[PDB]
Structures are given as C-alpha cells and as structure tokens.
Amino acid sequence: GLSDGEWQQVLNVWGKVEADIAGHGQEVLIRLFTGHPETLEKFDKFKHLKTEAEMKASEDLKKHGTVVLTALGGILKKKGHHEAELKPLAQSHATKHKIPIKYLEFISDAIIHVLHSKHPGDFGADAQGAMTKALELFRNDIAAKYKELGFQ
Numbered sequence: 001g002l003s004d005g006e007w008q009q010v011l012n013v014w015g016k017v018e019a020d021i022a023g024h025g026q027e028v029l030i031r032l033f034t035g036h037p038e039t040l041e042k043f044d045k046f047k048h049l050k051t052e053a054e055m056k057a058s059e060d061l062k063k064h065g066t067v068v069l070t071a072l073g074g075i076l077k078k079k080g081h082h083e084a085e086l087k088p089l090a091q092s093h094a095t096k097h098k099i100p101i102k103y104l105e106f107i108s109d110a111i112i113h114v115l116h117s118k119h120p121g122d123f124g125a126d127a128q129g130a131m132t133k134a135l136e137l138f139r140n141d142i143a144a145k146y147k148e149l150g151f152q
C-alpha cells in the first residue's frame with residue numbers, strides 16, 4: 001500500500017526508465033544473470049550466453065528486457081489496481097516458466113541497482129523508498145497467487 005506521494009515518486013522514477021527502456025532492460029537482465037547464474041538456466045533462449053560480452057552483444061536479450069520492463073511499467077501505472085494485469089503473469093511464471101518467488105526478489109533488487117548505476121546521485125532516498133515499496137507490492141501479490149497454486 002502506497003500513498004499518492006509515493007506513487008508520484010514511482011512514476012517520476014519510471015520516466016527515467018521510459019527514456020531508454022531497452023538500455024535499462026538490458027542492464028537489469030545482465031545484472032540478474034551475472035549476479036545469480038542459476039536464473040540464466042530458466043531461459044532456454046539465453047542459456048547459450050557464457051560471457052557478459054555475449055550478453056551485451058545479444059539483441060534478443062535487449063528485446064526481452066523491453067518486454068519485461070514494458071509489462072512492469074504497465075503494472076506500476078495502475079498504482080496498485082493491477083489484478084487483471086498481474087494474474088496472467090503470476091500464472092505463466094508459476095505454471096509454465098517455473099520461476100520461484102526468490103528470483104522475483106533478485107530482479108527487484110537488480111532494478112534498484114541499475115537505477116543507481118545509470119543515474120548516480122539522481123535516485124534519491126525518497127525515490128528508492130517508494131520504488132522498493134512498489135516492487136514489494138508487486139512481489140507480494142504474485143506470492144498470493146503462487147500460494148493459491150501451491151507453487152514453490
């Protein structure tokens with residue numbers, strides 16, 4: 001649960017992402033894969049990437065970063081009223097992709113890391129607080145659907 005002022009911070013931060021969605025999405029995925037190599041094994045279409053240079057050169061990885069961040073941005077713009085947008089993603093990630101909730105924690109922290117890396121000194125303490133709370137709400141509502149499905 002976020003206040004109006006917190007949602008305003010989230011959507012202000014998101015404007016930074018929307019100016020270069022593919023570059024942000026690329027770096028989020030590279031941070032996830034290099035920090036947590038077990039996550040790469042969930043992607044049949046990326047498991048061939050062995051080095052970070054290959055990851056950086058991959059146009060399909062940048063494409064997938066755009067897909068991921070476009071979906072997240074659509075959810076965030078709902079300011080918590082995201083049941084319809086979140087349900088299919090929870091269902092596909094539990095039943096088809098088999099993504100443990102831990103990996104959604106990993107990607108949440110990776111988003112925070114990338115924002116500081118690309119906007120150093122321009123991602124203030126209030127903005128980090130609000131973004132973190134928004135990613136926690138997203139993860140928590142996915143977790144409720146995972147529990148319904150019995151997925152661990």
Ligand code: HEM
Pocket residue numbers: 039040042043044045067068069071072088089092093097099103104107
């Ligand atoms: C911010 C969180 C994330 C968002 C918004 C997101 C969004 C999406 C979207 C929109 C798709 C395509 C449609 C679908 O299959 O439902 C997708 C596919 C996928 N997601 Fe996620 N995702 C997230 C986190 C992750 C994480 C943490 C993992 C794994 C570590 C992951 C693994 C996958 C895989 C395996 C696919 C299928 C890729 C394919 O082969 O083309 N997702 N995701």
